[PDB]
């Protein structure tokens, strides 16, 4: 678990999932 | 160094779409994530989203086929808007702050069960002023540094 990486990954996922 | 970091973030994002952890993203997984974040993609839309990046025609997205797709994206005139759209998804009550409960809800949608400690750590990383919630600025800085 890397908190920074996880949060960035989730933001990118959210960006892709919403365009 | 920035590229090393970026590939790891991309692998993380890949892993969040890959709900079942089998190492590939299916149309069903994409649809489940999109719906859980509110949206309503059609079947035709989900299939189009796969079909453009599915270089071997097997109907699923492996990490290179996801990673190439990030290799195409460029900084553009919608780049900051895209981050703002994402912030708005996290901010479920629309008060301009991401609380722990909101962050945790998103992560659960992405197939992650985080401990209280893990959610706290994530808030701490992004919480600039230390009030225990994440402002838009906190969120933007995450994607800058
Ligand atoms: Ca999968
Ligand atoms: Ca494929
Ligand atoms: Ca909120
Ligand atoms: Ca704050």
Numbering used by the authors:
A (entry chain B): 1 to 19
B (entry chain A): 3 to 147
The authors write:
CaM is a major Ca2+ sensor that regulates several target proteins involved in cardiac muscle contraction, including RyR2, Cav1.2, and CaMKIIδ. CaM is a Ca2+ sensing protein able to bind up to four Ca2+ ions through its Ca2+-binding EF-hand motifs: two located in its N-domain (EF-1 and EF-2) and two in its C-domain (EF-3 and EF-4). The associated structural transition to an open conformation upon Ca2+ binding mediates interaction with CaM’s targets and signal transduction. At high [Ca2+], Ca2+/CaM binding to CaMKII releases the regulatory domain from the catalytic domain.
Ca2+/CaM and the E140G mutant were cocrystallized with CaMKIIδ294-315 to gain molecular insight into the interaction. Glutamate at position 140 (E140) is one of the Ca2+ coordinating residues in EF-hand 4. Interestingly, in the LQTS variant structure (G140), this interaction is lost and replaced by a water molecule, HOH10, coordinated by the residues I130, N137, and Q135. Ca2+/CaM-E140G–CaMKIIδ294-315 showed two extra unique H-bonds between Ala147[O]:Lys8[NZ] and Glu87[OE1]:Thr18[OG1] compared to Ca2+/CaM-WT-CaMKIIδ294-315. The Met144[O]:Arg4[NH2] H-bond in WT complex is replaced by Ala147[O]:Arg4[NE] H-bond in the mutant structure. Compared to CaM-WT, the variant E140G showed a missing H-bond at Lys75[NZ]:Met15[O]. This structural discrepancy is likely responsible for the missing α-helix between Phe65 and Lys77. The dissociation constant of Ca2+/CaM for CaMKIIδ294-315 (0.052 ± 0.008 μM, n = 8) was significantly increased to 0.097 ± 0.008 μM for the E140G variant (n = 5), indicating a ∼2-fold reduction in binding affinity.
